[PDB]
Design a protein around this ligand. Structure first.
Ligand SMILES: Nc1ncnc2c1ncn2[C@@H]1O[C@H](COP(=O)(O)OP(=O)(O)O)[C@@H](O)[C@H]1O
Ligand SMILES: [Mg+2]
Length: 329
């Protein structure tokens, strides 16, 4: 029984895999503050978004793939590490954290320090797309080109991997948050209705699609000019029109990456195509849209919200592998 853990420190969700057990925590990366003092973290805090009374706020400290607020991010990480601690497990926890590939040295050090402050003995860091590819089952250690597109909340990470390293990697700030924001802006312009982020995510999941048709649902929010509650209907067709711009940006980032490939690796990617992971991979039709623009097969990973955590967990379970990650960090 171990306290070694692997943390997918996501812009939107944090997952923790614990050695010998598997995923033991999956909660939103949200912290609620009371006037400032921490009031709630995780599942309870997300439910507060857009619903807070005076003297309270709810914050996503890792929102855009960068640390927005270092103190709040540290309290969030420590809260989750403490939550999974097993008093019957061994001590001196080894911790792997998956961080955005663009994370700077300062952010990496802050993440390291947060884990040490929560009791970690040693911390190793792995970049998002490598962990995503491992957890999606791609053969990243082989001499063959594997391409992964990980659509998260604040970012999409695109990479081509071979022989345990990176051939190409780029992230852009377009993923599920920009999809939500496009839906908010759409409702404002076309229905004079102000909606919040939770309603926007609900539209996205229930009727959002990357491909115009259709079906409709009821949406409620604040009248734009006068402020009063209002209910309106929105269709798949409207949702698809709302989402076209961020979808196109994700598709462009994928296309750009392909221009970046050595011939024999291009040959491998022509063969097997592109693997999608992350929650944004669940956007209906996004696989088809990428396929149309690239000419390549597109597969959605099994359990795409969990791939990064499963991939980190795989590394954590392999002492040789883990020792190497710790060392190169
Ligand atoms: N069914 C769905 N359709 C579209 N987007 C979805 C769906 N389910 C989850 N998402 C989106 O996935 C994003 C979260 O993906 P995730 O990989 O957990 O991000 P991160 O690793 O950055 O925390 C959110 O924007 C969420 O709304
Ligand atoms: Mg992620």
């Amino acid at each position: 029984i171990s306290n070694d853990i692997a943390i997918d420190l996501g812009t939107a969700n944090t997952l923790i895999y614990q050695k010998g057990k598997g995923i033991v925590l999956n909660e939103p990366s949200v912290v609620a503050l009371r006037n400032k003092v921490v009031h709630a973290v995780g599942i309870e805090a997300k439910q507060m978004l857009g619903r807070t009374p005076g003297h309270m706020e709810a914050i996503r400290p890792m929102r855009d793939g960068v640390i927005a607020d270092f103190e709040v991010a540290e309290e969030m990480i420590k809260y989750f590490i403490r939550k999974v601690h097993n008093r019957k497990g061994s001590g001196n926890p080894k911790v792997i954290v998956c961080v955005p590939s663009g994370a700077t040295a300062v952010e990496r050090r802050a993440i390291n320090d947060s884990c040490l402050n929560a009791g970690a003995r040693r911390v190793g860091l792995i970049d998002e797309p490598m962990a995503a590819a491992i957890g999606a089952g791609l053969p990243i250690h082989e001499p063959t080109g594997s391409m992964v597109v990980d659509i998260g909340g604040g970012t999409t990470e695109v990479a081509v991997l071979s022989l345990s390293g990176i051939v190409y990697s780029r992230s852009v700030r377009v993923g599920g948050d920009k999809m939500d924001e496009a839906i908010i802006s759409y409702m404002r312009r076309h229905h004079n209705l102000l909606i919040g982020e939770t309603t926007a995510e609900r539209i996205k999941k229930e009727i959002g699609t990357a491909r115009a048709p259709g079906l409709s649902i009821d949406v409620k929010g604040r009248d734009l000019m006068q402020g009063v509650p209002r209910e309106v209907r929105i269709s798949e067709k409207q949702a698809a029109d709302a989402l076209a711009e961020p979808v196109g940006q994700i598709v462009e980032a994928v296309k750009v990456a392909l221009e970046a490939t050595p011939p024999e690796l291009a040959s491998d990617i022509a063969d097997k195509g592109i693997m999608l992971t992350g929650g944004g991979a669940l956007l209906r039709g996004l696989d088809a849209e990428i396929r149309d623009h690239t000419g390549l097969p597109v597969t959605v990973a099994d359990d795409p919200l969990s791939c990064v955590a499963l991939g980190c967990g795989k590394v954590l379970e392999h002492p040789k592998w883990m020792k190497g990650v710790l060392e190169s960090t």
